[PDB]
Amino acid sequence: MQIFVKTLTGKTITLEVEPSDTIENVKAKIQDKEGIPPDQQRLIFAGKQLEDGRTLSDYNIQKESTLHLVLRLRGX
């Protein structure tokens, strides 16, 4: 199924996922497309930061859901 990830610049990324995908795997899919290391990524859905070992289904993230990608930043 597809989900969408909205980045800080307003770009929308489309990911191919399954409900059993872990947040860690989703972050690796985002790295594939945007080049951001997973350890820098904070994924937000329903106002909550998603934890790495959980699955999309654990958060009831269904087809055509949109997540926000925010970033850890340091500097110077």
């Binding site: 909205k6 610049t9 925010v70 930043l73 500097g75 110077x76």
Partner: protein
Amino acid sequence: GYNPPGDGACGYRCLAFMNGATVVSAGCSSDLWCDDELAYRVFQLSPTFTVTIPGGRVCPNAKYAMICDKQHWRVKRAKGVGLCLDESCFRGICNCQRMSGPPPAPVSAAVLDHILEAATFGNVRVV
């Protein structure tokens, strides 16, 4: 805005700038660099800015954008009064409309000093 020198305390210099203060650093290693978590602690006491990257969205009610560009922090003045609400505003993903309101109170120099001193194990202090 404000573009700090490139010394290790650069992000702390930005936080101070947005609160009408300056800092002195005895040296700030990369493990002690200002990060988004520390910036959020300061935001919670005077919620006037969004932390983001170049081209990133700023809360419409932010007075400043604190921008991390290739591991260098700087501050740009934004178009709001400094009336941000919560962490969604801090990250630039809120649904705010620009509002008018009274100018925001900065974090006091002493309160900011304690946060910076603790975060940098004494190496960065407010002047």
